[PDB]
Structures are given as structure tokens and as C-alpha cells.
Amino acid sequence: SGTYRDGLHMSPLLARHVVSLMDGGTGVDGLREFRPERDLISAWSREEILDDVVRHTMATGYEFPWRLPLEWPHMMETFLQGPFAELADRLSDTYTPPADLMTAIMFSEREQQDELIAYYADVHREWH
Amino acid sequence: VIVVGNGVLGLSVGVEIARTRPDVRVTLLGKPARQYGATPAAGAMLGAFGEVTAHALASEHGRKKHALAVQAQRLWPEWIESLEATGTAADGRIKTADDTVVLLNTVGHSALDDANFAAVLTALKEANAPHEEIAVESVDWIDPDPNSRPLRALHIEGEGSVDSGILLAALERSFLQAGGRLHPVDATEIRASHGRVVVTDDGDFLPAGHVVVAAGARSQRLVAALPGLAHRIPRIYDGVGVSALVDTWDGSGPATVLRTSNRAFACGLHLVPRAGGSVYIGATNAVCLEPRGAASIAETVFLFNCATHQLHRGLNGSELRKVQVGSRPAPIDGFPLIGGTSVEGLWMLSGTYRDGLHMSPLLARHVVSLMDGGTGVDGLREFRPERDLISAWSREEILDDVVRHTMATGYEFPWRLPLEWPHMMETFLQGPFAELADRLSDTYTPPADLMTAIMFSEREQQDELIAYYADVHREWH
Amino acid sequence: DVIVVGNGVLGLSVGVEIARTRPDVRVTLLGKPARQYGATPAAGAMLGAFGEVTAHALASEHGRKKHALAVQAQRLWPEWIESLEATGTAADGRIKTADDTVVLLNTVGHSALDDANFAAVLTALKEANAPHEEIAVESVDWIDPDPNSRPLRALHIEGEGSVDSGILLAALERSFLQAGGRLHPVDATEIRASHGRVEGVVTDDGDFLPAGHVVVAAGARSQRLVAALPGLAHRIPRIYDGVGVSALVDTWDGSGPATVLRTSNRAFACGLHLVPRAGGSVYIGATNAVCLEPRGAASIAETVFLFNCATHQLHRGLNGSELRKVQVGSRPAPIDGFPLIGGTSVEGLWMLSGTYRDGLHMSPLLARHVVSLMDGGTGVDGLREFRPERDLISAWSREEILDDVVRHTMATGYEFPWRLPLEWPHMMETFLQGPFAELADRLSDTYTPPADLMTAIMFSEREQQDELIAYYADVHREWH
Ligand SMILES: Cc1cc2nc3c(=O)[nH]c(=O)nc-3n(C[C@H](O)[C@H](O)[C@H](O)COP(=O)(O)OP(=O)(O)OC[C@H]3O[C@@H](n4cnc5c(N)ncnc54)[C@H](O)[C@@H]3O)c2cc1C
Ligand SMILES: Cc1cc2nc3c(=O)[nH]c(=O)nc-3n(C[C@H](O)[C@H](O)[C@H](O)COP(=O)(O)OP(=O)(O)OC[C@H]3O[C@@H](n4cnc5c(N)ncnc54)[C@H](O)[C@@H]3O)c2cc1C
Ligand SMILES: Cc1cc2nc3c(=O)[nH]c(=O)nc-3n(C[C@H](O)[C@H](O)[C@H](O)COP(=O)(O)OP(=O)(O)OC[C@H]3O[C@@H](n4cnc5c(N)ncnc54)[C@H](O)[C@@H]3O)c2cc1C
Ligand SMILES: NCC(=O)N[C@@H]1[C@H](O)[C@@H](OC(N)=O)[C@@H](CO)O[C@H]1/N=C1\N[C@@H]2[C@H](O)CNC(=O)[C@H]2N1
Ligand SMILES: NCC(=O)N[C@@H]1[C@H](O)[C@@H](OC(N)=O)[C@@H](CO)O[C@H]1/N=C1\N[C@@H]2[C@H](O)CNC(=O)[C@H]2N1
């Protein structure tokens, strides 16, 4: 599971991998990293993800595509940085959600954000 | 008597001093270039009811300003008669229209345009002013883009316009006729000693027992060099305004002023009729911490786009005669600086922002009455030039207003964007403006027009304002 | 005595060349400092050769000749500038403002113009062995476009540059005086000829100036001036006003690009370009509308369109930059789409006009051509077809022009750029064909106006259309 955009494409390879593991083999070399039972992976710095989430947020405008005064995109770029930086810091000292999930958390209810702070904390206690 | 400044205010007080005191020599300073001059860039509308906003009529200070504008309106017919009397047919007519039509369209924020249309209607009813809501199909001349068209229209009777250029010529002519002397140089410094009252930019010195400062946006910078007055006269900034003269495709023009209510950050759309197949369109407004003598591309495009879509598509193929730029004197606390000073013989007539020209006859009569030992006009006492910064609104009201006006710049464009985006911008604008207001001062909050300028200024310019606000608190509290 | 009528780039350029190569003769140049309707002072200006290439131009014999002349003109510019700057000092300023041009391809226009014209420019550069390369858009210096208006392809053309048209005019005036030329700041009212020879020029102050040579380079007024002579009303092709709007902008930070920045030519010979200037200024242009009467002022529409394209397609920083000046000049727009260069049936009467978008670029070559002809030479080979005294050229079939005028009409939509329901462009394509086909058939059995002029005629008054039907008929009777 957790194949997001390309499980269907990878299906023949992923199926062969799991069957090899079930038969006492090692399957496909690179897939060991993606063991289902693991600490949350941190593939990017908080800094990389905060740049990415602001860039992707701005991209939702250009993809529409919007038409607006030329000052406005510069205003939105600078006023988006603070709130996303604040959310990332509030969520966990160690884990940063990738951009796709961070925007969903940003626009979720306070209760759902607090539940994620608890989840991230409980995962840290289990693995640190 | 020396009048410093050759705008509508300087020349209007100059004319009234010269006429009512034939004993005294009155000299008026300022150059024909009229650098940063608001008056020559003005249409201009004799704006009283047209200037009504919900926000203005919710503060005590705003309801006073409105009352003065209504009083000023009554002086205009005899003031024009008395200025045209010193000239001939060939000098042209000061008055270009008697009536104004206010248009409501959807090319703006509902939170400004809907509220302000209702407030104008209300203020007209309260004052028993002659007006009626008319069918949009009965408004003459206009040919808007259907997607930008008005759906409601308001005819205001006896609210009109003047040619600001013919007004200036008539004031100069009337000043000379009454014995005034025009010296085409700029004041560099006001000289005072032992608390009593000009060095000019050619090096000369002119003595006087009365100095009236009406130097538009430069008025406070000139008086603030005197001892203590740096933190006792409220700062005046440049409300930079862009307008245009257009020769219409067929030489036609509307019989009335055409306008919207005031829009984001005291911008607004209007067309003022002119003689000889020309129209005036205006006007943008941006508070700048340093003066600027040239229109931006953005200001030009916005003014032209609004006029062609919301007023007449015929303006699209019409010839651009002139792009005009002037500085509305923008007082830091949002109210004019009119009257006497702690220095004997030193008077100030400035910080009139959008409507100094309209109020000129009343403001001139007020200052002359004060100079002759009178009390002048009742309601103008609150606008003493030497004062603590007025706080006409709560920090909360101003933070709601600045976010609303910021959003309005979008709806006025008008923008097209995903429907989630306006909600995102509303919530993400609140924090930064709240943070700026708290950082600037514990006591003073700049009005919205100035707050947005401060928000997008350099850190050095923000820090300088924090020092200014602190020094003003120490002087007055 | 030689009299040059006109003080634009063409008049002054031929003036300089006559004065320099004939020190024996007195050369007098007419025209006032106001330069009313003057194309030259409103120009950036680009030394446009490859940048001016369109698919449509390079599909006609007459268009491939014009291109060849523009390539020839380019080779003269380095020595021409050297020879003009040599008569001045450092403090007079540099004529050259850039050496190179970047052509940008964005989607703020019709694919049928911009895609076809980008390919045609690339092809014409390859054919002429001109130094150039397709570069990464990320490697174009200075530009900061709106992402939705950004270029996705860019073409660096080496040795295709720009001049400050104002410093060029000053350097031409200076160089003219240095070579013994005399400037008389009045306008010609009338050319006098008798027994098929030039006598001289009546000026607007009432005076009469005698001469054995008169060169007319009065821009858009050139044909109206020569047509008063016997027979010539229907023997010299009419020139109209290609009214052009440009602007000088002081950039927010005093910066400017190192190269010319431009698109290919767009709807009705409009186009977007930025020409570098000294002292924190840039030139942006340029609109184009053929007008049947002259117009001295930009429209609101022209100003907004120029500013909107520059701020979105070139640099968003121009949005907050200060407008110094809106400039208006008249491109001399010949009715048959080709210049009027050379000799006349009247001895001593020469004409140098109808250069539309690229008179300034071709000036050194056109000046050398007319001087060679005046000295009994043949001048430049390819310029014979553009004799000023001619039947109207028919460089394209009526069919080609009707396809072109509809395509350019549609392009005015895509260049805005418009947003409308997807059925609407297909409806407009089909409903535009009939009216333009009807106009072309009504105007003449033989002559078809080029697209730029046809749209102007389409939206002119019935009286102005009828006058053109009479003109075209009178020209047919004179030549056929
Ligand atoms: C719009 C879209 C476009 C896509 N395009 C591509 C593409 O172009 N290329 C590509 O490679 N992939 C594409 N994908 C899919 C991507 O590859 C996925 O990662 C992949 O399909 C996941 O497959 P899955 O079998 O894990 O999950 P699913 O396809 O979701 O199958 C899981 C199934 O289990 C069932 N189920 C749930 N709970 C239970 C239960 N308790 N007991 C039994 N059954 C249960 C569900 O009903 C469902 O049928 C796309 C997906 C979407 C949504
Ligand atoms: C775009 C625009 C539109 C407007 N529209 C309207 C309208 O519709 N209705 C309306 O009522 N009003 C309008 N106004 C004007 C508004 O009322 C102003 O508040 C008013 O014009 C201010 O007049 P003033 O004499 O105080 O200043 P100004 O008109 O600026 O005159 C001050 C003069 O002092 C000169 N000066 C500066 N320094 C010195 C010095 N050291 N010595 C001497 N002289 C000096 C300046 O060059 C200038 O000429 C408009 C203004 C602008 C810019
Ligand atoms: C907006 C715009 C942009 C341009 N951009 C470019 C560019 O990027 N690159 C380029 O190569 N070229 C450019 N051009 C110019 C183009 O090449 C023109 O074809 C060229 O300038 C024509 O030169 P001219 O000397 O024939 O005309 P003009 O410049 O019009 O000169 C004619 C002069 O004669 C004067 N005159 C008129 N009547 C009389 C009379 N009776 N007697 C005496 N004098 C008279 C006029 O006032 C005028 O000054 C541009 C032009 C415009 C309008
Ligand atoms: N790039 C040239 C161009 O677009 N030509 C147009 C063209 O012929 C038709 O429009 C489309 N879109 O095809 C046409 C429909 O009326 O209007 C044209 N535009 C004009 N003509 C006006 C006059 O010269 C005076 N005032 C202006 O501002 C000019 N604007
Ligand atoms: N009606 C006033 C207004 O919209 N104010 C803007 C406002 O403060 C912010 O933008 C929004 N939309 O809220 C802000 C973000 O930089 O820009 C403001 N506008 C400007 N500042 C520029 C400078 O004065 C010089 N050149 C221009 O062209 C001016 N335009």
C-alpha cells in the first residue's frame, strides 16, 4: 500500500517483490527502505518542504489560470511563508509532513491538527 | 502677509486676505511648474455627498468633515460669480457641471461599494438634499461594457464640477485685481524668534507679521524645522493621484459628473465634463512616504481600464491628451491642519487629502476670520494644526478596514481566481497587519490608506515611524 | 543646388551622404524641430532584419527582396555609426544601445502568426548564415515575466541591435553641418517643375528655393507633396499614416536588459519590444494602426495594450515603474505595401519614403542607393522593383490577403489575450470571411489592399471606401 500516484505502474514489480519475501527470498533490492513497519521517513529538511508548499500553493493560482494585479502574487508569496512555518513548528520537533499533506493539515479543523500533534508525539516516543 | 503655496488653498486665502484687508501687502509664493501640485491634477468634483463612505459617517470626526463639505457647497455659486467677474467671456467658465450621477456596478468589493451607496443615499435623505434614485437606462451618454455596467444610479442635484485650470487662472487674476503680488519663488525656511514670525530659494529674505503655509504636501516639513513643532504639527505625506485628459472620439461629453463612491484606499472612478470636446477621468490614490512626480504603468492602466469598461467604451478609441500627477496632502491622522499655531502670525492650511479644492472657499473664510480676531466656522476647531495625533477609529476598526480595502484592490481590477483564494488571503492578511499596528505604537494607529503604505515600505522607514510616534506620545501624554 | 525635403532619419541620412560625396554642391535640408507625426523620434529603435521576418513576407517574391535589402543594410551599420560618432565626442552619447536581440516565443498570441513567424525567423537566419542560437529561456538576462505570459523558447541573434533614435538624429544633424550641409527650419509647401525638370521648392514662409535636385523624404506626407505635379496623382502610389505608439519608462531600480527583447511581428504589423536606453530608461513599443487621415495622439486602447504586454510578457517590474513619455509617430504606410525609393519621370525629382516599419534600419543603404542614382550610377540591385513611379504592386493573390486579414483579425483576440467560450473563435473565423471577401471584390477587379490597410478600409466611412474605389479605378486607367 501507500503507492500514491504509481502503484498501478509498479504493480507487477511490487507483487513479485512481496511473493519473493513470502517464499524466504530478498525480492527487489531497493524496496527494503519501504518496509511497512518503520519510524516515519524524513526524506527532506523542513526548509525544503516549506519552500515546496509555498511554491505549490502559488502554482494552484498559475494553473487555474488566474488573472490578478501584478503586485498580488508577490504579496501572497511573502504572507504564505509565516503561517506554514508556524504550522510545521507546532506539529512536531522532529517530523515534517510533505507539502501535499501539509496543505491538507493547514486547512483542516483545530481538533484534527491537535490529533496529528498527538500522533507525531506518540510515534517519536515509540521509535526514539 | 506672505502666503506660502500657489494651489487652490494658497490662492483662495490670498484672494480673501487681499479683498478684505486693502490696508496690508499680501505676497503669494510658488512657481508656475506647481511641482507635485494636487489642484492642476484635479477634475475637479465639488464633492460633498459623493465623498460619503459608511466608514467616514461611523466616526465623530468623519461626520464633522461631511458637515463642513455641505457648508462649503453653499458658498460655490457666489465664489465663482466673484472670480469670473474679474475676467471676460474668453477666460472660459469655472463651472463644468451642476449635477452628479453616482453609479453602482459590481467591479469592486460589496463591503465598500454596497455599504457606501447605502451611506450616500442615507446622508442625502438626512440633509434633505435634492436627489433621486433613477433607472440606469435614463443616465445620458454612458456606454459601459454590459459585464461592467451599473444596475443602480443616483442623481444628486447641485453637486457639480469646476475646471481646476480655469479656477487657478481666475484665482491668480482675482488676486492681482485685489492688489496681491505674485513672487514666483519657493519658501526654503520660515524665520521666527521670541515666538513670533520667509527665506526664499533664490537666497532673498521677505519680512512679514503673518505667514500662511498652504504648500500642499510640503506644508508640515516647512513648519516642523521651528523649535518643538516637529512633534506638535501632524506629518503630511503625498497622496499621489493620477488622472487623464481625453479628447472624446466624437467631441461629446456627459452633462453631469459620473462617479462611483470612494474605493480601495481612497481611489475612485469619475469623469468630470470639460469644454471643447475634452473629458477628465480620474483618479488613483497611493500614499507615498517620499514624493513621486510621475504616474506608474499600473496606475495609468487601472484608470483607463475602469473608465472604458464602467463609463464609456468610446473612450477606448479616444485620444489621450495628457496624463496628470499631483500629491493629495495626506495627514498622518486622517484630518486636515487648518488654523493658528503656538507661534504668533503663523497659520497653516493643509492636509485636505481628497477635498481641499471643494472646501477652499469655506477654509479661506475660516482662516481670514481667525486672522482678523474672529472665531471663523464652528466645526473647524477640532482640526487645529498644532495637536496630538487624532485617533478617530479603534485599532480593531482600522485592521478590519485595511484588510477589506486590500481585498477590494482585487475585486476592483477585477481579478479572476479560484474561489478558495480570496478566503485564504482574507485570513493570511489579518496577522501581518495586526503585527505591524502593534509594533508601530501602543497608542496611535495609522489610517488604512497610510498603514498599507507603511506595510510595503523599507524596514528603516518603519523604524523611523516607530520613533516619530514615540516622540509624539512623549510630547503630548 | 540639392534640396532634401524632410528631417527624419531618411532625409538627414541622404543629406549627410550627398554633402560628404559632393563637396562642390550646396545641399539644403528642410523640416522643423517639432518633427510633427515623425516616425524616427517615436522609434526605439531596433536595427530589424531577421527580427522583422514573417512567414507571410518570405512567401512573396517582393517580400524576399525587402528581406535581402534589410540584411544588406545591417552590414553598413557598424561603419555608418563610426563615421557619425567620429564628428562628435564621448559626451554626445552612444548611438548604439545594444549589439544583440533576443526573440521570445510566448502563447499570448495566435499560433498561426507567432509559431509560423518563429520558424520563419529561424529558417531565414540559417539561410543567410547569420550568427544566432536557440537558448534556454532561463539564460535570457533581466526578464521577469508573469508565468502565464512567459516565453518557452528564445532566440539570440548576434549583431542585430538597437540605436537611440534621438542620439542618431543629433549625430546626423551634427554630421550634416560638419560636411557643409545647411539646415533651413521651414516646411516645403510645393515642388515647382516645368518642361519635365525640377526648378526648386516653395516653403511655408512664402520664400522660393531654386535647385536642380529635390529629394522628397517627408515621411507620410511624401506622396501628397509629389502628387500635385501633372499626371503624378495616379503614378506615385499613395502613402497613409501607420500611427505607432511607444513609451519611455524609468525602471524601478535603474536597470535595463543587455539586448533588445522582442516578439516576431503580430496582428496588423504591431509587435512587442523593449530597446535598452542609457540612464535608467527603457523604450517599449510598439502599436500600429493604418489611419486614412493623420493622428498625432495615442488612443487609450493603444496605451493600455502596449503597457499590459510589456508588464506581463517582459518584466513585471515595469508595472511599478514611472511613465516618462507616451510617443506617437506615423510609419509611412504605402498602399501597395512596398517602399517608394529612387527616380521620377521629372528630371532631378527623387523620392525616399513608404518604408513603414524599417526605414530607419535601411536608411544607410537607401541613402547610398539614391546618391548612386543621382551620380549616374545604378545603386543597389534589388531596389529597382521599388521605383516610386509605378503601377500598384500586387505581391499577393486576393485569396492570400483574405486568409491573412482574417488570421490577423483573430490574432487581435489571442494577443489581448481574450477569454471566451471555445465555440466563439470558430464562429468568428467563418463569419469574418464573407464581409472581407465582399469588401475586396467591391474595391477593385485588379488591386487588393494588404491586410494592414484592408482592416482600416473595412472600418472606415462609406465615403472613404468610395473614394478608394475611384482612386483604384483612376490608377487602372493610367497604367492598363
Ligand atoms: C484519479 C487517479 C488516477 C490515477 N492514475 C494513475 C496512473 O496514470 N498510473 C498509475 O500507475 N496509477 C494511477 N493511479 C493509481 C495509483 O497507481 C494507485 O497507487 C494504485 O491504484 C493503488 O492501488 P491499490 O490496489 O493499492 O488500491 P485501490 O485501487 O484503492 O484498491 C483497494 C481496494 O480495496 C478495497 N477495500 C477497502 N477496504 C477493504 C476491506 N476492509 N476489505 C477488502 N477490500 C477493501 C477498496 O474498495 C478497493 O477496491 C491513479 C489513481 C487515481 C485515483
Ligand atoms: C488626482 C487628483 C484628483 C483630485 N480631485 C479632486 C476633486 O475631485 N475634488 C476636490 O475637491 N479636490 C480634488 N483634488 C485636490 C484635493 O482637494 C487637495 O486636497 C487640494 O487640491 C489641496 O490643495 P493645496 O493648495 O493644499 O495643495 P496643492 O494644490 O498641491 O498646492 C500647493 C502648491 O504649493 C507649492 N509649493 C510646494 N512647496 C513650496 C514652497 N516651498 N514654496 C512655495 N510653494 C511651494 C506646490 O508646487 C503647489 O503648487 C484632487 C487631487 C488630485 C491629486
Ligand atoms: C512607434 C514606432 C516605432 C518604430 N520602431 C522602429 C524600429 O524599432 N526600428 C526601425 O528601424 N524603425 C522604426 N520606426 C521607424 C520606421 O523605420 C519608419 O519607416 C522610418 O522612421 C521613416 O523615416 P522617415 O525619415 O521617412 O520619416 P519621418 O521620421 O516621419 O521623417 C519625416 C520628417 O519630415 C517632416 N516633414 C513633414 N512634412 C514636411 C514638409 N512638407 N517639409 C519638410 N519636412 C516635412 C516631418 O515632420 C518629419 O520630421 C518606428 C516608427 C514608429 C512610429
Ligand atoms: N493593430 C491595429 C488594429 O487592431 N486595428 C483595428 C482593426 O482594424 C479592427 O479591430 C480588430 N480587432 O480587428 C477595428 C475595429 O474597429 O479596430 C482597429 N483598432 C483601432 N482602430 C482605431 C483608430 O485608428 C483610432 N483609435 C484607435 O485606438 C484605433 N484602434
Ligand atoms: N490604490 C493604492 C494601492 O493599491 N496600494 C497598494 C497597496 O499598498 C499594496 O497592494 C495591495 N494591492 O494591497 C501594495 C503592494 O506593494 O502596492 C500598493 N500600490 C502601489 N505601490 C506603488 C508605489 O507607490 C509606486 N508605484 C505604483 O504603481 C504604486 N502602486
Short mmCIF file of C-alpha atoms in Angstrom, two decimals, chain A residues 57-58 60-61 64-69 71-72 75-76 79-80 83-84 106-107, chain B residues 406-407 409-410 413-418 420-421 424-425 428-429 432-433 455-456:
data_model
loop_
_atom_site.label_atom_id
_atom_site.label_comp_id
_atom_site.label_asym_id
_atom_site.label_seq_id
_atom_site.Cartn_x
_atom_site.Cartn_y
_atom_site.Cartn_z
CA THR A 57 0.28 26.95 -3.27
CA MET A 58 1.28 29.71 -5.78
CA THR A 60 -2.65 26.48 -7.86
CA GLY A 61 -3.08 30.14 -8.99
CA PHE A 64 -6.22 28.00 -12.94
CA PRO A 65 -5.00 30.17 -14.62
CA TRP A 66 -5.81 33.31 -12.53
CA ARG A 67 -5.77 36.93 -13.77
CA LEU A 68 -4.96 39.43 -10.99
CA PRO A 69 -2.97 42.64 -10.35
CA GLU A 71 1.50 43.14 -7.01
CA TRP A 72 -0.75 40.34 -5.61
CA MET A 75 2.11 39.77 -1.52
CA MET A 76 0.77 36.15 -1.33
CA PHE A 79 2.26 36.24 3.53
CA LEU A 80 2.12 32.39 3.00
CA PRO A 83 1.68 30.58 8.59
CA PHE A 84 3.22 27.39 7.01
CA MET A 106 -3.22 23.72 7.19
CA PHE A 107 -6.93 23.84 6.08
CA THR B 406 -6.68 45.22 0.40
CA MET B 407 -9.27 42.62 -0.79
CA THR B 409 -7.93 46.10 -4.85
CA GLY B 410 -8.61 42.55 -6.16
CA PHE B 413 -9.23 45.04 -11.00
CA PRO B 414 -11.38 42.97 -11.40
CA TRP B 415 -9.40 39.71 -10.78
CA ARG B 416 -10.43 36.18 -11.82
CA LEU B 417 -9.07 33.49 -9.45
CA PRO B 418 -10.04 30.17 -7.82
CA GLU B 420 -10.74 29.29 -2.32
CA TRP B 421 -8.08 32.04 -2.83
CA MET B 424 -7.09 32.25 2.09
CA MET B 425 -5.93 35.90 1.50
CA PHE B 428 -3.47 35.41 5.95
CA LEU B 429 -3.63 39.29 5.71
CA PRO B 432 0.74 40.69 9.40
CA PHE B 433 -1.37 43.94 9.61
CA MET B 455 3.36 47.76 5.39
CA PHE B 456 5.17 47.84 1.95
#
